[PDB]
């Protein structure tokens, strides 16, 4: 059961709301992350003019609709929206939805009661991405056309001046498209049209009024060399980096040499300045001359073409497998289970060990059966080698085409390779995906994209007998 | 005994651990990250959505069509059900501020920008690929050499092979193959050791530099990353009498004549971002300045409390290191033929030694020639009356900053005439006056500028007075040192900037005073403009309002920047310098254009800087918006202070929060930390400097830059504050005081540090050490 990937369960199309007759898009989807464990998961899908809020409930009926739309909000202003994130009222604990777009303001909506909580004003251009800090749900980061990131606080002490921090200087020089928080809440990634990925270290913020925001002039790592194009989406995976650029058809897993979130947070005067205008990478973290970053792996993501603003999401949760999801620009949704890499490498190890420790007389047996290594050893005694093969390894001894199929999906030996999707689900009709979001317990995966369509994927369902 | 092919075979086998280690490492990091997956935090105790049912049905209403799916295919079950939903409309309570790009940071003074790269694509891409692989493989070269153990196939010997090969021509340089073969030398050992190194290199390029690929690297590419080879290809280099000259060379090369820092905004940047500091080396190094200090000396108190040689002058004193003989030599040369100050006391406190000791190692200077060829005065400028006359506006270009090219101040030996190659008399289209930094003395030289002659118990040095003010005629502010009648000495000191009664008397130093009029960012009254600048206090016609500060850039950097961005103020048209306020500047970047303005810019010469000052041309009431007529200044190169009541919304410059009529105007102190950091790191980046010079250079620079000195009038006071706040630090390490001693040495050589402060620092350092003796 733990090895199960999702399958399509529901799709819906939301009425066209940017009419010129069908160019409307869902640009963001995010599940509420503050409900008590096991509560029915709720998610918001953000179109250009509306926040669609829907509850998902597993069913026993193959033909029942698990989806119920519990709230529907229209931004009655002149703005077109494309970024959202969740937070919480600091006094009442009710959910707040933050919505942001091309006028440059973040609207915060009290969604259980259909009212505006407040507006965050100060950006000089459209906002393209929002992120809440995992360490403080009252801290939001916004990435703008104006080149800066702003850090906002909904905490009561900062109500008269809620911008606690601006990330400026000369880190970025064109519109930012992506902003992401590390789990500790103090490291922020930013990326955009200038092809630079930056890592900033935020200070601790005073818990009292701030007449001006802290300003930070220098990121602690900076590089335009990981991609060769505009970067439209970036994220931590623990201490590792995942990022994506237009025209490359990959998601790059890479790391910053010498960066550990177990070291102390460097201060702003530890940042590297640009004393050399020909260096395209600089890093405070560098431990003959070493790389400052290293490419680890490249998830192959074919047929994005020239589309940008297409975002992936990793499901990363204690005691469940990590899953990377992403939808391309031709109607396909790609999944990778990161725990298959270790189980595949562990399987290929036991295979090659036994093909020498028994001169080739090796029988391979499936797991996920009633059959132990102990039961299977009984059938041929100590004469033969029995190696247990993951059930999800399917052939295409073993064929050459089978080994190449398995290496393509699971071999991590080439950092400039292309790791094929582990599952690749086709989508009916033309569909460019913009954003993916997972439910807390990971049984739901929602992909939103053009045509105001949402595709809802399930696993671990309860359906039986139509 | 090897062949290229048997070597290429073994490198092939050794190379297949690279993907293996990679897979091992990626798998390890993936497994590690999964285990430390983060628990979701800040869970509520209760489902906040629990009470909310489906909203499916004059309310605004919207459609949703749902489909169900099943099977591995994802095929539907039917065409799907449709439902209508009420729409809650929420308007926002606030407007966005006007458009802007970049974070706008304040700077108190202009800063000097480096030239930036403009970022064929395929060559860029391929080099990146090769670089990434070079870093993959570099850690393997030495474990594999160890494992193969072929004679003469060592990292050093492969570096020697590379330096002797025909590609040392397209890659290398005079001094590049020199100091390679200085650290390494040419001998590669046995004839078979040279054969091995060359067969290895070729086997490597055959295995790893397969020209069929993008993931490919030559051995040369890896050897170039070596910590001992790389410095040879790094162009960040700072560089009896020849003893001193070489000791002070860091300070005579880096130390700025204007603001006394060693990384500052003055001086010239070249196309490759090599910087010529505005330093003693631009006016002849140590010697011309020093031979002149002596020549002035020949043509002419209390004891130190460290066992003064004046009283004592036994044995039992430790031997002397050569570091500390030099220390007494260079303080002996640059104090020179003094009457009121002698080395022994000051060396005595630099080094922890008794004042009588340095006298008995002292007791245990080239001759100075006395000429003044008497020159006839120019008819258009009397320097003793400090006045210009007759056709002066035609004989000189001293006031026409737009036509002027910059030159090193003259440091020749004779009169300032074309015949001796004096740049002042002859470099430009016309004579310009010699300035503070020329080695002539307005006594030898008729071209020397002598300051103005105004004195008045009222206001003076004004835009039009009986006798005009020569400083105002030359479009320059007064010099705190030359202009002794007008009060410039006190009014150009920024510590008196808000002494309103001081400044009601004695008026041509607004840029150095550094007080701008109270102004306020707001949304401009003009349609098709975003932000504008509004006066916050009454400004009378004639008053200075604000300076136009920004990044100083060259013509081609300006071009590169207009491209990169899809508003560049001209400072010096003929020299080609522009001020760019797109990111770094002050609130004057927000002043709008109008053909009928109420302020006006003027380029002013300010103590060998050029600077843009804005002056009112009408009375301006608080709340009024400021305009000036742009003209040609922007070429296409390709009583508490209160927020005024105004029709237009006003903004805090940083928070972009909206200001309310009548609350206190936000005066935010200027944040310069990010700027100190860049200068600290620019010094750190020099390969030419020892760690002990870096440490002191960076400690002085951090102090002196925050003071923005433009004038040696104020250096002795800040020099005293430095020795006081840092004397505990200067006597802790012996490196520090000796570096200190060179700074002092080269400031004395320029006669820029009076010796009344050298004997005073001798006190603070002897005292400081007396308290360290715990
Ligand atoms: C990188 C792009 C380009 C080179 N660039 C650089 C900067 C610094 C800058 C700014 C900006 O920082 N300004 C503030 C401001 C200043 C600094 C001075 C004055 C007198 N006044 C001001 O406001 C704004 C815009 C821009 C674009 C479109 C636009 N419109 C489009 C359609 N109509 C509605 C709005 N408006 C402004 C471009 C900029
Ligand atoms: Zn300077
Ligand atoms: Zn003495
Ligand atoms: Zn001269
Ligand atoms: Zn001169
Ligand atoms: Zn002269
Ligand atoms: Zn005067
Ligand atoms: Zn004067
Ligand atoms: Zn004056």
PDB file of C-alpha atoms in Angstrom, chain B residues 383-625:
ATOM      1  CA  UNK B 383      46.043  84.940  -7.115  1.00  0.00           C
ATOM      2  CA  UNK B 384      47.148  87.336  -4.374  1.00  0.00           C
ATOM      3  CA  UNK B 385      43.988  89.417  -4.677  1.00  0.00           C
ATOM      4  CA  UNK B 386      42.081  86.181  -5.453  1.00  0.00           C
ATOM      5  CA  UNK B 387      40.283  87.697  -8.412  1.00  0.00           C
ATOM      6  CA  UNK B 388      39.690  87.108 -12.115  1.00  0.00           C
ATOM      7  CA  UNK B 389      39.705  89.971 -14.609  1.00  0.00           C
ATOM      8  CA  UNK B 390      39.084  90.956 -18.241  1.00  0.00           C
ATOM      9  CA  UNK B 391      38.599  88.074 -20.737  1.00  0.00           C
ATOM     10  CA  UNK B 392      39.005  85.420 -18.053  1.00  0.00           C
ATOM     11  CA  UNK B 393      35.912  83.518 -19.212  1.00  0.00           C
ATOM     12  CA  UNK B 394      37.804  82.976 -22.488  1.00  0.00           C
ATOM     13  CA  UNK B 395      41.384  82.284 -21.349  1.00  0.00           C
ATOM     14  CA  UNK B 396      40.529  79.368 -19.061  1.00  0.00           C
ATOM     15  CA  UNK B 397      38.151  76.429 -18.945  1.00  0.00           C
ATOM     16  CA  UNK B 398      38.474  76.044 -15.154  1.00  0.00           C
ATOM     17  CA  UNK B 399      34.755  76.757 -14.731  1.00  0.00           C
ATOM     18  CA  UNK B 400      33.356  74.862 -17.761  1.00  0.00           C
ATOM     19  CA  UNK B 401      33.003  71.431 -16.174  1.00  0.00           C
ATOM     20  CA  UNK B 402      31.217  69.993 -19.237  1.00  0.00           C
ATOM     21  CA  UNK B 403      34.288  70.479 -21.489  1.00  0.00           C
ATOM     22  CA  UNK B 404      36.882  69.357 -18.968  1.00  0.00           C
ATOM     23  CA  UNK B 405      38.870  66.130 -19.081  1.00  0.00           C
ATOM     24  CA  UNK B 406      40.450  64.809 -15.895  1.00  0.00           C
ATOM     25  CA  UNK B 407      44.198  64.584 -15.421  1.00  0.00           C
ATOM     26  CA  UNK B 408      46.594  63.632 -12.669  1.00  0.00           C
ATOM     27  CA  UNK B 409      47.496  66.883 -10.823  1.00  0.00           C
ATOM     28  CA  UNK B 410      50.900  68.081 -11.971  1.00  0.00           C
ATOM     29  CA  UNK B 411      53.914  66.639 -10.234  1.00  0.00           C
ATOM     30  CA  UNK B 412      56.729  67.887 -12.505  1.00  0.00           C
ATOM     31  CA  UNK B 413      59.837  69.668 -11.199  1.00  0.00           C
ATOM     32  CA  UNK B 414      59.761  73.064 -12.911  1.00  0.00           C
ATOM     33  CA  UNK B 415      57.302  75.859 -13.677  1.00  0.00           C
ATOM     34  CA  UNK B 416      53.749  74.999 -14.787  1.00  0.00           C
ATOM     35  CA  UNK B 417      54.145  75.631 -18.501  1.00  0.00           C
ATOM     36  CA  UNK B 418      53.526  73.614 -21.641  1.00  0.00           C
ATOM     37  CA  UNK B 419      57.328  73.330 -21.958  1.00  0.00           C
ATOM     38  CA  UNK B 420      57.597  71.116 -18.809  1.00  0.00           C
ATOM     39  CA  UNK B 421      54.597  68.959 -19.731  1.00  0.00           C
ATOM     40  CA  UNK B 422      52.365  70.455 -17.019  1.00  0.00           C
ATOM     41  CA  UNK B 423      48.866  69.021 -17.626  1.00  0.00           C
ATOM     42  CA  UNK B 424      47.195  71.981 -16.013  1.00  0.00           C
ATOM     43  CA  UNK B 425      48.563  74.613 -18.370  1.00  0.00           C
ATOM     44  CA  UNK B 426      48.438  72.490 -21.500  1.00  0.00           C
ATOM     45  CA  UNK B 427      46.495  69.190 -21.329  1.00  0.00           C
ATOM     46  CA  UNK B 428      43.130  70.773 -22.078  1.00  0.00           C
ATOM     47  CA  UNK B 429      41.918  73.117 -24.737  1.00  0.00           C
ATOM     48  CA  UNK B 430      42.950  75.937 -22.355  1.00  0.00           C
ATOM     49  CA  UNK B 431      44.818  76.453 -19.083  1.00  0.00           C
ATOM     50  CA  UNK B 432      43.050  75.266 -15.954  1.00  0.00           C
ATOM     51  CA  UNK B 433      44.200  76.436 -12.500  1.00  0.00           C
ATOM     52  CA  UNK B 434      46.311  74.060 -10.412  1.00  0.00           C
ATOM     53  CA  UNK B 435      44.414  72.647  -7.409  1.00  0.00           C
ATOM     54  CA  UNK B 436      45.108  71.587  -3.801  1.00  0.00           C
ATOM     55  CA  UNK B 437      46.833  68.369  -4.973  1.00  0.00           C
ATOM     56  CA  UNK B 438      49.329  69.910  -7.421  1.00  0.00           C
ATOM     57  CA  UNK B 439      52.863  70.091  -6.071  1.00  0.00           C
ATOM     58  CA  UNK B 440      53.315  73.722  -7.067  1.00  0.00           C
ATOM     59  CA  UNK B 441      52.753  76.372  -4.409  1.00  0.00           C
ATOM     60  CA  UNK B 442      50.824  79.519  -5.315  1.00  0.00           C
ATOM     61  CA  UNK B 443      54.074  81.245  -4.872  1.00  0.00           C
ATOM     62  CA  UNK B 444      55.941  79.417  -7.542  1.00  0.00           C
ATOM     63  CA  UNK B 445      52.963  78.963  -9.862  1.00  0.00           C
ATOM     64  CA  UNK B 446      50.681  81.702 -11.282  1.00  0.00           C
ATOM     65  CA  UNK B 447      48.068  79.067 -12.118  1.00  0.00           C
ATOM     66  CA  UNK B 448      47.538  78.090  -8.430  1.00  0.00           C
ATOM     67  CA  UNK B 449      44.058  78.546  -6.981  1.00  0.00           C
ATOM     68  CA  UNK B 450      44.113  80.493  -3.687  1.00  0.00           C
ATOM     69  CA  UNK B 451      40.504  80.450  -2.450  1.00  0.00           C
ATOM     70  CA  UNK B 452      38.198  83.402  -2.267  1.00  0.00           C
ATOM     71  CA  UNK B 453      38.675  86.735  -0.489  1.00  0.00           C
ATOM     72  CA  UNK B 454      35.185  87.315   0.951  1.00  0.00           C
ATOM     73  CA  UNK B 455      34.708  88.284   4.578  1.00  0.00           C
ATOM     74  CA  UNK B 456      31.480  89.650   6.003  1.00  0.00           C
ATOM     75  CA  UNK B 457      29.717  89.715   9.320  1.00  0.00           C
ATOM     76  CA  UNK B 458      26.634  89.086   7.145  1.00  0.00           C
ATOM     77  CA  UNK B 459      26.058  86.588   4.356  1.00  0.00           C
ATOM     78  CA  UNK B 460      28.812  86.247   1.747  1.00  0.00           C
ATOM     79  CA  UNK B 461      30.053  84.074  -1.136  1.00  0.00           C
ATOM     80  CA  UNK B 462      26.688  84.553  -2.855  1.00  0.00           C
ATOM     81  CA  UNK B 463      25.496  84.070  -6.412  1.00  0.00           C
ATOM     82  CA  UNK B 464      25.874  87.802  -7.075  1.00  0.00           C
ATOM     83  CA  UNK B 465      27.162  90.209  -4.409  1.00  0.00           C
ATOM     84  CA  UNK B 466      31.020  94.877  -5.107  1.00  0.00           C
ATOM     85  CA  UNK B 467      33.813  92.333  -5.711  1.00  0.00           C
ATOM     86  CA  UNK B 468      32.399  88.946  -6.780  1.00  0.00           C
ATOM     87  CA  UNK B 469      33.309  85.665  -5.144  1.00  0.00           C
ATOM     88  CA  UNK B 470      35.910  83.868  -7.251  1.00  0.00           C
ATOM     89  CA  UNK B 471      34.697  80.471  -5.998  1.00  0.00           C
ATOM     90  CA  UNK B 472      31.163  81.187  -7.285  1.00  0.00           C
ATOM     91  CA  UNK B 473      32.576  82.436 -10.599  1.00  0.00           C
ATOM     92  CA  UNK B 474      34.549  79.197 -11.037  1.00  0.00           C
ATOM     93  CA  UNK B 475      31.369  77.180 -10.205  1.00  0.00           C
ATOM     94  CA  UNK B 476      32.927  75.610  -7.117  1.00  0.00           C
ATOM     95  CA  UNK B 477      32.170  75.502  -3.444  1.00  0.00           C
ATOM     96  CA  UNK B 478      34.586  77.126  -1.030  1.00  0.00           C
ATOM     97  CA  UNK B 479      37.554  75.174   0.344  1.00  0.00           C
ATOM     98  CA  UNK B 480      37.565  74.800   4.193  1.00  0.00           C
ATOM     99  CA  UNK B 481      41.340  75.357   3.998  1.00  0.00           C
ATOM    100  CA  UNK B 482      41.837  78.085   1.332  1.00  0.00           C
ATOM    101  CA  UNK B 483      38.798  80.273   2.040  1.00  0.00           C
ATOM    102  CA  UNK B 484      39.633  81.737   5.453  1.00  0.00           C
ATOM    103  CA  UNK B 485      37.518  84.874   5.391  1.00  0.00           C
ATOM    104  CA  UNK B 486      34.096  83.500   4.602  1.00  0.00           C
ATOM    105  CA  UNK B 487      33.777  81.037   7.501  1.00  0.00           C
ATOM    106  CA  UNK B 488      33.993  78.007   5.230  1.00  0.00           C
ATOM    107  CA  UNK B 489      36.178  76.207   7.795  1.00  0.00           C
ATOM    108  CA  UNK B 490      33.199  75.918  10.171  1.00  0.00           C
ATOM    109  CA  UNK B 491      30.268  75.884   7.686  1.00  0.00           C
ATOM    110  CA  UNK B 492      31.657  73.052   5.524  1.00  0.00           C
ATOM    111  CA  UNK B 493      32.008  70.908   8.681  1.00  0.00           C
ATOM    112  CA  UNK B 494      28.961  68.563   8.771  1.00  0.00           C
ATOM    113  CA  UNK B 495      29.003  68.596  12.587  1.00  0.00           C
ATOM    114  CA  UNK B 496      27.621  72.170  12.348  1.00  0.00           C
ATOM    115  CA  UNK B 497      25.027  71.369   9.666  1.00  0.00           C
ATOM    116  CA  UNK B 498      21.973  72.291  11.804  1.00  0.00           C
ATOM    117  CA  UNK B 499      23.544  75.253  13.635  1.00  0.00           C
ATOM    118  CA  UNK B 500      21.041  77.623  12.066  1.00  0.00           C
ATOM    119  CA  UNK B 501      22.699  80.689  13.595  1.00  0.00           C
ATOM    120  CA  UNK B 502      26.110  79.655  12.291  1.00  0.00           C
ATOM    121  CA  UNK B 503      24.734  79.404   8.754  1.00  0.00           C
ATOM    122  CA  UNK B 504      22.793  82.719   8.797  1.00  0.00           C
ATOM    123  CA  UNK B 505      26.142  84.441   8.107  1.00  0.00           C
ATOM    124  CA  UNK B 506      29.373  83.783   6.197  1.00  0.00           C
ATOM    125  CA  UNK B 507      26.932  80.543   1.918  1.00  0.00           C
ATOM    126  CA  UNK B 508      28.750  78.580  -0.873  1.00  0.00           C
ATOM    127  CA  UNK B 509      29.214  75.228   0.871  1.00  0.00           C
ATOM    128  CA  UNK B 510      25.755  73.624   0.784  1.00  0.00           C
ATOM    129  CA  UNK B 511      26.960  70.299  -0.613  1.00  0.00           C
ATOM    130  CA  UNK B 512      29.627  69.897   2.079  1.00  0.00           C
ATOM    131  CA  UNK B 513      27.336  71.044   4.869  1.00  0.00           C
ATOM    132  CA  UNK B 514      25.130  68.118   3.832  1.00  0.00           C
ATOM    133  CA  UNK B 515      21.751  69.453   5.001  1.00  0.00           C
ATOM    134  CA  UNK B 516      18.973  69.049   2.490  1.00  0.00           C
ATOM    135  CA  UNK B 517      15.665  70.838   2.703  1.00  0.00           C
ATOM    136  CA  UNK B 518      12.784  68.812   4.199  1.00  0.00           C
ATOM    137  CA  UNK B 519      11.082  66.926   1.329  1.00  0.00           C
ATOM    138  CA  UNK B 520       8.647  64.064   0.987  1.00  0.00           C
ATOM    139  CA  UNK B 521       7.803  61.348  -1.522  1.00  0.00           C
ATOM    140  CA  UNK B 522       4.258  61.380  -2.888  1.00  0.00           C
ATOM    141  CA  UNK B 523       2.170  60.544  -5.931  1.00  0.00           C
ATOM    142  CA  UNK B 524       2.950  63.137  -8.606  1.00  0.00           C
ATOM    143  CA  UNK B 525       0.363  65.741  -9.616  1.00  0.00           C
ATOM    144  CA  UNK B 526       1.231  64.908 -13.235  1.00  0.00           C
ATOM    145  CA  UNK B 527      -0.787  62.376 -15.129  1.00  0.00           C
ATOM    146  CA  UNK B 528       1.640  59.909 -16.763  1.00  0.00           C
ATOM    147  CA  UNK B 529       4.135  60.305 -13.920  1.00  0.00           C
ATOM    148  CA  UNK B 530       4.288  58.004 -10.940  1.00  0.00           C
ATOM    149  CA  UNK B 531       6.102  59.468  -7.938  1.00  0.00           C
ATOM    150  CA  UNK B 532       7.117  63.046  -7.337  1.00  0.00           C
ATOM    151  CA  UNK B 533       8.959  64.952  -4.653  1.00  0.00           C
ATOM    152  CA  UNK B 534       7.120  67.504  -2.517  1.00  0.00           C
ATOM    153  CA  UNK B 535       8.601  70.266  -0.414  1.00  0.00           C
ATOM    154  CA  UNK B 536       7.786  69.703   3.266  1.00  0.00           C
ATOM    155  CA  UNK B 537       8.989  73.145   4.415  1.00  0.00           C
ATOM    156  CA  UNK B 538       9.053  76.604   2.903  1.00  0.00           C
ATOM    157  CA  UNK B 539      11.978  77.026   0.511  1.00  0.00           C
ATOM    158  CA  UNK B 540      12.998  80.568  -0.434  1.00  0.00           C
ATOM    159  CA  UNK B 541      14.289  81.334  -3.905  1.00  0.00           C
ATOM    160  CA  UNK B 542      18.064  80.859  -3.937  1.00  0.00           C
ATOM    161  CA  UNK B 543      18.246  78.174  -1.229  1.00  0.00           C
ATOM    162  CA  UNK B 544      19.911  74.848  -1.872  1.00  0.00           C
ATOM    163  CA  UNK B 545      17.344  72.041  -1.784  1.00  0.00           C
ATOM    164  CA  UNK B 546      19.067  68.674  -2.302  1.00  0.00           C
ATOM    165  CA  UNK B 547      21.914  66.915  -4.141  1.00  0.00           C
ATOM    166  CA  UNK B 548      21.477  64.442  -7.032  1.00  0.00           C
ATOM    167  CA  UNK B 549      23.366  61.380  -5.816  1.00  0.00           C
ATOM    168  CA  UNK B 550      23.724  57.987  -7.459  1.00  0.00           C
ATOM    169  CA  UNK B 551      26.064  55.408  -8.988  1.00  0.00           C
ATOM    170  CA  UNK B 552      28.809  56.993 -11.106  1.00  0.00           C
ATOM    171  CA  UNK B 553      29.174  55.171 -14.420  1.00  0.00           C
ATOM    172  CA  UNK B 554      30.937  55.499 -17.752  1.00  0.00           C
ATOM    173  CA  UNK B 555      29.469  55.925 -21.231  1.00  0.00           C
ATOM    174  CA  UNK B 556      29.585  52.236 -22.175  1.00  0.00           C
ATOM    175  CA  UNK B 557      28.293  51.074 -18.801  1.00  0.00           C
ATOM    176  CA  UNK B 558      25.447  53.512 -19.295  1.00  0.00           C
ATOM    177  CA  UNK B 559      24.736  51.977 -22.701  1.00  0.00           C
ATOM    178  CA  UNK B 560      24.887  48.408 -21.339  1.00  0.00           C
ATOM    179  CA  UNK B 561      22.375  49.548 -18.707  1.00  0.00           C
ATOM    180  CA  UNK B 562      19.830  51.204 -20.999  1.00  0.00           C
ATOM    181  CA  UNK B 563      19.804  47.892 -22.921  1.00  0.00           C
ATOM    182  CA  UNK B 564      19.558  45.651 -19.835  1.00  0.00           C
ATOM    183  CA  UNK B 565      16.524  47.695 -18.683  1.00  0.00           C
ATOM    184  CA  UNK B 566      14.632  48.031 -21.990  1.00  0.00           C
ATOM    185  CA  UNK B 567      17.152  58.466 -16.590  1.00  0.00           C
ATOM    186  CA  UNK B 568      20.988  58.842 -16.506  1.00  0.00           C
ATOM    187  CA  UNK B 569      22.078  62.290 -15.279  1.00  0.00           C
ATOM    188  CA  UNK B 570      25.155  63.820 -16.985  1.00  0.00           C
ATOM    189  CA  UNK B 571      27.855  64.890 -14.513  1.00  0.00           C
ATOM    190  CA  UNK B 572      30.881  65.401 -16.804  1.00  0.00           C
ATOM    191  CA  UNK B 573      29.972  65.333 -20.499  1.00  0.00           C
ATOM    192  CA  UNK B 574      33.485  65.430 -22.004  1.00  0.00           C
ATOM    193  CA  UNK B 575      35.001  63.045 -19.472  1.00  0.00           C
ATOM    194  CA  UNK B 576      31.986  60.756 -19.913  1.00  0.00           C
ATOM    195  CA  UNK B 577      30.708  60.252 -16.352  1.00  0.00           C
ATOM    196  CA  UNK B 578      26.996  59.867 -15.560  1.00  0.00           C
ATOM    197  CA  UNK B 579      25.069  59.581 -12.281  1.00  0.00           C
ATOM    198  CA  UNK B 580      22.534  56.706 -12.220  1.00  0.00           C
ATOM    199  CA  UNK B 581      19.881  56.839  -9.484  1.00  0.00           C
ATOM    200  CA  UNK B 582      17.774  53.834 -10.550  1.00  0.00           C
ATOM    201  CA  UNK B 583      18.666  51.983  -7.317  1.00  0.00           C
ATOM    202  CA  UNK B 584      21.153  54.032  -5.301  1.00  0.00           C
ATOM    203  CA  UNK B 585      20.486  57.696  -4.768  1.00  0.00           C
ATOM    204  CA  UNK B 586      18.282  59.823  -2.611  1.00  0.00           C
ATOM    205  CA  UNK B 587      14.847  61.389  -2.803  1.00  0.00           C
ATOM    206  CA  UNK B 588      15.934  63.770  -5.590  1.00  0.00           C
ATOM    207  CA  UNK B 589      15.623  60.897  -8.040  1.00  0.00           C
ATOM    208  CA  UNK B 590      11.868  61.436  -7.778  1.00  0.00           C
ATOM    209  CA  UNK B 591      11.759  65.098  -8.930  1.00  0.00           C
ATOM    210  CA  UNK B 592       9.677  65.452 -12.107  1.00  0.00           C
ATOM    211  CA  UNK B 593      10.181  67.387 -15.325  1.00  0.00           C
ATOM    212  CA  UNK B 594       8.478  70.694 -16.134  1.00  0.00           C
ATOM    213  CA  UNK B 595       9.522  73.335 -18.651  1.00  0.00           C
ATOM    214  CA  UNK B 596       8.662  75.894 -15.951  1.00  0.00           C
ATOM    215  CA  UNK B 597      10.488  74.418 -12.953  1.00  0.00           C
ATOM    216  CA  UNK B 598      10.974  75.769  -9.449  1.00  0.00           C
ATOM    217  CA  UNK B 599      14.413  74.203  -8.900  1.00  0.00           C
ATOM    218  CA  UNK B 600      17.493  73.905 -11.075  1.00  0.00           C
ATOM    219  CA  UNK B 601      20.572  71.653 -11.137  1.00  0.00           C
ATOM    220  CA  UNK B 602      24.150  72.904 -11.344  1.00  0.00           C
ATOM    221  CA  UNK B 603      27.346  70.862 -11.594  1.00  0.00           C
ATOM    222  CA  UNK B 604      29.689  72.052  -8.809  1.00  0.00           C
ATOM    223  CA  UNK B 605      33.365  71.348  -8.246  1.00  0.00           C
ATOM    224  CA  UNK B 606      33.651  70.348  -4.551  1.00  0.00           C
ATOM    225  CA  UNK B 607      37.219  69.747  -3.342  1.00  0.00           C
ATOM    226  CA  UNK B 608      38.146  67.731  -6.447  1.00  0.00           C
ATOM    227  CA  UNK B 609      34.756  65.996  -6.644  1.00  0.00           C
ATOM    228  CA  UNK B 610      32.045  67.064  -9.084  1.00  0.00           C
ATOM    229  CA  UNK B 611      28.540  67.005  -7.714  1.00  0.00           C
ATOM    230  CA  UNK B 612      24.989  67.941  -8.697  1.00  0.00           C
ATOM    231  CA  UNK B 613      23.232  70.506  -6.511  1.00  0.00           C
ATOM    232  CA  UNK B 614      19.610  71.661  -6.878  1.00  0.00           C
ATOM    233  CA  UNK B 615      18.794  75.291  -6.077  1.00  0.00           C
ATOM    234  CA  UNK B 616      15.391  76.980  -5.860  1.00  0.00           C
ATOM    235  CA  UNK B 617      14.474  79.459  -8.597  1.00  0.00           C
ATOM    236  CA  UNK B 618      11.144  80.408  -6.965  1.00  0.00           C
ATOM    237  CA  UNK B 619       9.650  80.578  -3.520  1.00  0.00           C
ATOM    238  CA  UNK B 620       8.208  77.143  -2.770  1.00  0.00           C
ATOM    239  CA  UNK B 621       5.596  76.612  -0.095  1.00  0.00           C
ATOM    240  CA  UNK B 622       5.372  73.453   1.970  1.00  0.00           C
ATOM    241  CA  UNK B 623       3.240  70.949   0.101  1.00  0.00           C
ATOM    242  CA  UNK B 624       4.269  72.203  -3.354  1.00  0.00           C
ATOM    243  CA  UNK B 625       5.771  69.691  -5.802  1.00  0.00           C
TER     244      UNK B 625
END
